[PDB]
Ligand binder design. Structure first.
Ligand SMILES: CCCCCCCCCCC(CCCCCCCCCC)(CO[C@H]1O[C@@H](CO)[C@H](O[C@@H]2O[C@@H](CO)[C@H](O)[C@@H](O)[C@@H]2O)[C@@H](O)[C@@H]1O)CO[C@H]1O[C@@H](CO)[C@H](O[C@@H]2O[C@@H](CO)[C@H](O)[C@@H](O)[C@@H]2O)[C@@H](O)[C@H]1O
Lengths: 73, 85
């Protein structure tokens, strides 16, 4: 589990999911399977980075809101 | 009276043309349905999903439409035809 094996596995899985959902054999086009693996890995890594950034820029804003509330007295 | 012509071909190079469209009528074979290379689909046959048509079958519906249902097989050397009435 390194945010990339899960991404690659999920991309390959959704590639076979799309391929077999049209009633086709699962491994029709291997090239789109490998590009799906790549896209899944990239999207998973970027999702992890975006989550970290979202938390980082949410804490610094929640602190500002709490400080603004604390100046009531 | 019978006479030869040079338009005749003693070796049809291309093959058999398994799918024979008749004007606008086209054999509607669905994906995941096995149709052997020897099978001849002509006229307006429709093969549905999960079906299978085996080699030697001469499915042709040039007179009336012929249909094969889901997961239904037409075995080898089976000639299927249709009539006007
Ligand atoms: C949908 C199916 C879900 C099935 C799996 C579910 C299980 C998910 C866990 C798997 C997983 C990937 C998530 C995959 C998402 C799938 C994307 C779907 C679309 C794909 C097509 C999340 O696992 C960790 O991710 C962290 C991300 O924040 C979070 O930790 C919290 O974060 C804090 C935030 O502020 C919190 O404050 C705090 O409490 C926690 O620390 C938690 O989510 C969790 O601990 C694996 O961890 C991955 O995340 C990080 C940290 O390891 C790694 O990157 C790091 O980057 C640098 C610093 O970022 C580091 O310097 C660097 O060293 C490292 O490289 C990755 O390499 C990998 O390790």
């Amino acid at each position: 589990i390194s945010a990339t094996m899960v991404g690659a596995l999920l991309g390959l899985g959704t590639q076979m999911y799309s391929n077999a959902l049209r009633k086709l054999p699962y491994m029709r086009h291997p090239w789109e399977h490998v590009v799906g693996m790549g896209l899944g890995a990239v999207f998973a890594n970027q999702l992890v980075k975006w989550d970290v950034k979202l938390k980082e820029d949410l804490d610094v804003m929640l602190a500002k809101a709490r400080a603004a509330n604390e100046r009531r007295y | 009276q019978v006479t030869p012509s040079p338009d005749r071909v003693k070796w049809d190079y291309r093959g058999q043309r398994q799918i024979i469209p008749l004007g606008q009528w086209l054999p509607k074979v669905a994906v995941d349905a096995y149709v052997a290379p020897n099978v001849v689909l002509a006229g307006q046959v429709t093969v549905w999903d999960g079906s299978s048509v085996w080699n030697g079958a001469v499915l042709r519906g040039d007179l009336n439409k012929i249909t094969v249902g889901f997961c239904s097989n037409v075995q080898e050397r089976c000639v299927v035809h249709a009539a006007w009435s």
